[PDB]
């Protein structure tokens, strides 16, 4: 009745030698986590990343959030902190006539499922999201202005959100062509701020931790379940579901996780406090809202595991005709590129993701010769701006292959689509390529040398 919280997500409280190496322990939970789509992880009671900043030189421009279920938001778009964290404050205290501390965290989940759902209140209220700058930085500790004894020891920590991307069983390190998806982002929260229901680019992970402040409410849902919750979705509020023009306008929105529950949509949730991390998994949908003044730090990543998810994911994006961030096939091959100083278990999977964009390449090949577009020339792909080599009906970012024809200088197509590049015969046409199977065969046997 009202509202029925959703089970818990499992919590994990690994021990120093567990938590010493990030990928290590979340390869260990991930047969449970991604059963839940989200989990928290409670760091040893000692690991206390020193978080120092002042209030009053910090600025950032809020975002305005109107609250209301099903309603299209989109995803990414003054004050200083202590500015905020009055309106915050006052907003909350305000608003239940208590002291913020006094508001139980369930009587604020209870609300701000009521006040979603209630066409007639229109509770309106702001945020921060940005990534990292100079007029605002990472919470945890950067090189640069001299660093205490202890800042020193959380520089260089795997779970130093910072260090995350650039780690050496992570994937998307050595790309490097993607700013507004490997920095971290910085999250100004206040009580009912929320995050709408979405998967990470990509199908990637997430990770977030909350610096300080009340607690983040959680909700998610595992990777299996991805296409049931966009099913509901679609019947709800179809709207969302209309194409946009790229990925700066992708439509989400707030839904009741009971709603999706009753779809038989399984559905966690956590309540993520101070000092708490909470991971996402590939495909692992999740939404939830702030509970009072907090402050937020998150960034994507890639693991070995997530190789093959993310060549799926590619090729969903191309059926439903949506913007890729990056390249897959680039950011495996700049991989095959380096193989000799890439981690070994990296290599054995890298290896194995190529032999099939390899052999997927090999029969698209095949069948646009038998479409009798004959010409081929060799042509640097990864040298293009990301908006010059999308394939004019699917929108993927092309870099093993495309087609194009001197009727329509500049416009490439994917081998997929080549009967939708323009009305010539295909004779008109050139094969455009990165690499021919010769090419391939070098960094395909460097890989397995490396891997042994
Ligand atoms: O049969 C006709 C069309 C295709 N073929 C040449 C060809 N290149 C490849 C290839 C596959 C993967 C990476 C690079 C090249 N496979 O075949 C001539
Ligand atoms: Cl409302
Ligand atoms: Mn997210
Ligand atoms: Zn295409
Ligand atoms: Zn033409």
Redesign the pocket.
């Known amino acids: 009745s009202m509202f029925l919280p959703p089970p818990e997500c499992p919590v994990f409280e690994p021990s120093w030698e567990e938590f010493a190496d990030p990928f290590a322990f979340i390869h260990k939970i991930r047969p449970i986590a991604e059963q839940t789509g989200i989990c928290k992880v409670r760091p040893p009671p000692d690991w206390q990343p020193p978080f120092a900043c002042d209030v009053d030189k910090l600025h950032f421009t809020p975002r305005i959030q109107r609250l209301n279920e099903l309603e299209a938001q989109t995803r990414v778009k003054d004050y200083t902190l202590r500015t905020f964290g009055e309106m915050a404050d006052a907003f909350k205290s305000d608003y239940f006539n208590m002291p913020v501390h006094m508001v139980p965290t369930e009587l604020v989940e209870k609300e701000f499922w009521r006040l979603v759902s209630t066409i007639e209140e229109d509770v309106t209220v702001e945020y921060g999201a940005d990534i990292a700058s100079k007029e605002f930085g990472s919470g945890f500790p950067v090189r640069d202005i001299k660093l205490s004894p202890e800042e020193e020891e959380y520089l260089d920590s795997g779970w130093n959100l910072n260090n995350m991307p650039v780690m050496e069983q992570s994937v998307l390190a050595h790309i490097t062509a993607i700013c507004g998806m490997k920095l971290p982002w910085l999250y100004v929260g206040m009580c009912f701020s929320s995050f709408c229901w979405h998967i990470e680019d990509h199908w990637s992970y997430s990770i977030n931790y909350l610096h300080w402040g009340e607690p983040k409410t959680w909700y998610g849902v595992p990777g299996y379940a991805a296409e049931q919750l966009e099913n509901v979705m679609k019947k709800l509020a179809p709207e969302l579901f209309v194409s946009q023009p790229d990925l700066l306008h992708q439509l989400v929105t707030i839904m009741n996780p009971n709603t999706l529950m009753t779809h038989e949509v399984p559905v966690y949730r956590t309540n993520q406090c101070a000092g708490e991390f909470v991971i996402t998994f590939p495909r692992a949908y999740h939404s939830g809202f702030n509970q009072g003044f907090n402050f937020a730090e998150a960034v994507n990543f890639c693991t070995v595991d997530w190789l093959p998810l993310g060549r799926q994911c590619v090729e969903h994006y191309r059926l439903l005709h949506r913007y890729c961030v990056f390249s897959h096939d680039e950011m495996i091959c700049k991989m095959a590129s380096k193989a000799d100083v890439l981690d070994v278990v990296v290599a054995s999977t890298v290896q194995k993701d190529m032999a099939i ?2 052999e997927d ?2 029969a698209l ?2 069948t ?3 479409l009798g577009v004959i010409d081929s020339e060799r042509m640097d792909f990864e040298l293009l701006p990301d908006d010059e080599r999308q394939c004019v009906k699917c929108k993927t970012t092309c870099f ?2 495309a087609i194009s024809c001197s009727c329509k200088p500049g416009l490439l197509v994917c081998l997929h689509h080549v009967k939708e590049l323009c009305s010539c015969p295909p004779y008109k046409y050139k094969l455009r ?1 990165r ?3 010769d ?2 065969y070098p960094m395909m046997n460097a890989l397995k040398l490396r891997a042994e």
């Open positions: 964009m390899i390449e090999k090949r095949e646009v010769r038998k093993m292959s390529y690499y021919t199977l090419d391939l």
